Amino acid sequence: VNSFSGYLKLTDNVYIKNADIVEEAKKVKPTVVVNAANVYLKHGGGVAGALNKATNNAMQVESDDYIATNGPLKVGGSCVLSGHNLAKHCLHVVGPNVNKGEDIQLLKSAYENFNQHEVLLAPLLSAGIFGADPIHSLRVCVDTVRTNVYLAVFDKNLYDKLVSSFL
Numbered sequence: 001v002n003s004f005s006g007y008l009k010l011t012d013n014v015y016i017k018n019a020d021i022v023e024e025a026k027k028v029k030p031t032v033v034v035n036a037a038n039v040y041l042k043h044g045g046g047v048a049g050a051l052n053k054a055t056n057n058a059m060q061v062e063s064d065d066y067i068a069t070n071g072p073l074k075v076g077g078s079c080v081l082s083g084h085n086l087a088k089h090c091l092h093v094v095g096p097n098v099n100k101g102e103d104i105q106l107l108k109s110a111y112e113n114f115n116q117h118e119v120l121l122a123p124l125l126s127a128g129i130f131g132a133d134p135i136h137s138l139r140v141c142v143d144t145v146r147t148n149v150y151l152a153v154f155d156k157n158l159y160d161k162l163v164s165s166f167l
């Protein structure tokens with residue numbers, strides 16, 4: 001039993017809700033919140049911009065130190081950093097950005113990072129400003145993640161379409 005509330009159950013392990021991931025994180029304080037990161041951990045917009053704003057830019061300060069030490073992530077890769085006031089940990093995961101021409105096949109690799117964590121709050125990777133089809137992203141999520149994932153879809157209209165079209 002966990003603290004996530006109001007999710008529709010899509011599969012044995014995947015749940016979905018129309019919710020702002022920032023507000024959901026502040027309420028649940030999950031062990032792991034997933035960020036829709038880029039390789040530079042520059043959290044300027046999209047999900048990352050919103051999460052970072054909610055940390056009063058502390059996420060960005062920590063991220064800049066991480067990059068200065070380790071260099072950029074790989075597309076499809078991840079790193080674990082602090083969750084600040086939102087969660088115990090933030091798993092920064094880099095899905096491919098279609099508006100940068102990156103191979104959508106790397107989306108499965110990106111979701112594989114979720115399997116290292118027993119429970120996660122997460123957005124659909126490569127969705128929104130990353131330009132991928134969110135319906136496809138949901139399919140890859142369900143077919144790749146085996147741990148318990150609670151997906152927050154900010155757009156109510158997109159949420160209804162994701163549910164109604166789910167196979």
Ligand SMILES: Cc1ccc([C@H](CC(=O)O)NC(=O)c2ncnc3[nH]ccc23)cc1
Nearest residue numbers: 036046047050123126127128130153154155
């Ligand atoms: C790569 C990538 C980018 C964004 C997203 C989802 C799309 C969605 O689920 O609608 N965006 C958000 O979560 C979002 N975007 C902007 N400001 C926000 N403030 C609180 C939440 C929030 C998914 C995947």
